[model samples]
Target: STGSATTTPIDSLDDAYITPVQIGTPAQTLNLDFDTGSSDLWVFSSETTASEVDGQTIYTPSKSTTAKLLSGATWSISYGDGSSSSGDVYTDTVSVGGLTVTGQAVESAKKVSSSFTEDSTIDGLLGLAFSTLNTVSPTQQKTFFDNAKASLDSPVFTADLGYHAPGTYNFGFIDTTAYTGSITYTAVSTKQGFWEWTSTGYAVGSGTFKSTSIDGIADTGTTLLYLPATVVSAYWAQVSGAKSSSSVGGYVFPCSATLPSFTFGVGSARIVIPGDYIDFGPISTGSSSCFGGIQSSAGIGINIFGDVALKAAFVVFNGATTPTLGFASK
Candidate 1:
């Protein structure tokens, strides 16, 4: 469930915190952390040795004023749960918050291990859904909406986290007061160029479901939404008549119940997976059979509605001007 997972106390105000889609310009902004489960964009350069701990903010871009360096290209990435990262490939002019874009596309991180050098809070990762699961393309394209889409004013892109605290990964603009309905617009399925999706039906309690519904491409950089075990064991057998346990690492349920309502369509956004997050919290393995935070994985390689279903929904990925992926409501 990790399209992106790195918690901390981030404010990262300046000294390198600009975004308007500049991967190699605009003062080389690098704050990162907007993963729709597996798209790519990385940072922390100057040949990172991994330092900045506890509230991360350590990007060098070779002491950027405006960094650039993509010579013959070199970078590595691999994750499904095996974790990996490689680097060297740059271009600058990026800034967030105050918005500014100019030739983006980045990835630096030169040599890292030791769990990414002991989890240095952060210093990179801003993969906006998909462009064929980025790693810097479009001529090694660095993201931030591929250089602010086209001066986004509503090209749309918003990630406003902080439900648990420390949120605000916005872009261009698209609040609309946390949406309320109608914003769906799915169609960009470059035949699995990363932003893949599917979902025509799904539900639990008061709707039953599993005669075959649908679900996919619902990411917030993953946190758990990999459905299909016959709809996750018929949605915990209607919330606890059994089948919520998967023995950890698969989902962790048991101890809370009364969860109904599971709706999911995501063609344009029709989310609802509450039951206190499908009522989970039981990881002792000593045996009590309480796991199942919605397990399964079907044929694998697709669904990823992560971040507990993107904190309930309100996402917009307008790609700045068109390559759309916008669904409103927060």
Candidate 2:
């Protein structure tokens, strides 16, 4: 079988991508962020403190007859941005798009950070990363994709992200028509429990491609493209007035500055991200200085190819016999 879902860019600057998820017996539809960076299918729920719940939708497992609480199972997740959520576990009927999984672990948030409370468009997260990263103690649960893999036409999923536009994610098969070229496959390393891989190198705009090894993870939950300081600096140097500001927290430049398109090698294929995609957006409403979509990952320890990079290509995560990642220009 196959499943597909449309992801809509949320917020003024499209800070994140969100899709609808139906949970429980009656199907409580909630807008969730399908995160390839995490491994928990967690959600804001009735168990969450009332004050912590802002405009976000909450799942009341009590309302679902099929919901069964796992007496001692609990989970927690900490994000790079310092936002976090934790709660008890419940196995229920969870569906994304048209694919349904019964007895799927659904972690309900008992508490959420202030950051999660303020950004209300995201009701919760459906982590798509390897199950090894699951935070549930003593009872690590399988991700929705993992549980559905056996029944799928193929054990693979695709990420077709967009900038201001909407995109679709397909499971069980490659929808090659969405891309311009044939898909190129690369070995994926899940040792760190992430969809990490090494790219051939990069090129800034029309500059010469640097033949170097760039190791990073494809994290759909992240907002920017994070690379080594050297590479990130090279891209900014071309901008008229760009600076790494401590006050602004990272690289910021004049809103009118010309942004160079970023290209990264996926195997032999060069996927180009338009200059506008890297411009990110103004730092603040009506602000003259804009924050770059590409930033230094030196502080982050691991480089990350987030929405900024993923939006430029159609990415496939193959979980068959041997895991592999595929990329194709759109």
Candidate 3:
């Protein structure tokens, strides 16, 4: 069976998008961030350190007769932002938009970072990345997507991220009406435990296509677009007053400056990101300096075609026997 779930930006900066999830027999509902960049369906639970939990909802497995602890098994995971969580493992009935997967491994958070505790809007993450990346010790587990794939109409999911609006995560099928033109399908390498793929080329603003192979992952969990230094500097060059400020951590520019659109190719298909998306909001409340969405992936392991890129197109994570990534203009 196919299913669809939707989410919206939660804050002024649109830091996270959360989808409602039902867990346990009584259906304890919680809002979970759908992260394709990581693998671990962890949540705040009764086991969580009391101090570590704030305004967030906690999942009390003891209250659910259906919850079964995978005794002795544990899991740990850290994110790109250095935020992290660790916990014991349990199997329970979990459902997202009516797409049910029984006996799903649910990591019950025993401890979490301040970043996780501080953000009250999201209770946990429903990882869409490959299960190989799961951090469970002794015995690893499949991701929620991986477990649900077998019963789906088609082993595929679509991430249509909207700009300051409602976006949907569709399971098992694609919404043809959500996009225009044709989908540019590209091969994905799950070798890295991610939706890793190589972009064929890119262009800055009205510039002509600059053919080059750039390897990156389609990460919905990440907020910015990371690329090669040359491409980033080139794009920054077009926006006067833009500067790479180490103090600020990324490219910063006058809030009033005009930004140029960024374009990247997906198997010959050009997906253009409006310059407006580059304005990642001011560096601080009411500050005159703002951050740029496009940054250099210099020290990072791989470039990231994150929300900045995914929001420009409807992306399909095709989980066929041989995985492939699909991108279509919206």
Candidate 4:
């Protein structure tokens, strides 16, 4: 079977993309973020304490005829940015686009961190990462993609993320018309439950490409590109008034600076990210200081090629046989 969904941006945030999904037999619809960084299909639910939930939508399992409580099962997850959530589990039919995964594990949040509780739009996260990253207790759970792969015509998904506009996430097949030029494929290391790959080298603007191999993960949930501290410092050094400001959190620079395009090498192909993409957004509304999208990954443990970088190219998450990544220009 094949399915597709349109990805919507969260206003001017340009942080994460959201997709709609239907749950249970009667189908209670919810808009969820398609996150490749983690593997837990969790939602703000009836199990959550009234005070813990804000204006966000909640999933009521009792209203669904196909919902069944996974007695004694629980889940808890902590993100790289320190945001966290935990709750009980339920078994239900979950459908994304037009593909449905029967008896899928759905984690209902009983508690959520301020970061999540404050976000009114995102009702939950539809994890597309490896099943190994699932946080459900008692027994591990498979992600929607994993559970539906066996019935899919092709075990692959294409992520065509756009700068500020809507994009499409195609499942079971890749749409050649969505991208330009030949797709470049790279082997991915899924040992860490991520689409981890190595960049053969990189370059800033028209500068010479450095033959420095950087290990990083393709994470859609993260908002910025995170590299090594030294690498981050080197990139910002080229900017006129760039500095690592503690008060600003990461590297901040004047919004008027002429930033350079970043190029990453994959085997023989080069994926270029435009200069403006690096200037994430203002540190604060109407502020002259803009936070550099590329930051130090020192404490995060793993470098992340987040939305800032992924939106520059069309990505293919190949789950067939040897997991691989295919990139092409949009």
Q: How many backbone clashes does candidate 2 have?
A: 0
lDDT of 2 at 313: 91
Give the alpha-carbon lDDT of every model.
Answer: 0.56, 0.92, 0.91, 0.90
lDDT digits (tens) for residues 1-330 of candidate 1: 001122333332111122223344235434555665555677666666545233445566656667777787776777665667777777666655556555465677676555545545456666766565665433545455655666555555655443344444566665566568667866555456555556667777568443344646655555556776667776766654454333344544445445665777755346675666544344553544454445667647556666655555666665533355655555
State the displacement of the C-alpha of residue 60, model 3, in Å, after optimal TM-score superposition. Answer: 1.1
Structure candidate 4, residue pairs in collision? none
For 112-211, candidate 4 gives per-residue lDDT tens digits of 9999888888999989899999999879999999999999989999898888889889999989898899999998999899989998888888989888
Sorting all predicted structures by TM-score, with the top scorer first, yields: 2, 3, 4, 1
Q: What is the lDDT of residue 289 in candidate 2?
A: 97
Evaluate residue 93 in candidate 3 and report its C-alpha lDDT on the 0 to 100 scale: 96
Minimal lDDT window, size 10, model 3: 7-16
- Candidate with better lDDT, 1 vs 3: 3
Ranking by lDDT: 2, 3, 4, 1
TM-score against native, each model: 0.33, 0.99, 0.98, 0.98
Off by over 4 Å in 2: none
RMSD of 2: 0.8
Best by lDDT: 2
lDDT of 3 at 15: 72
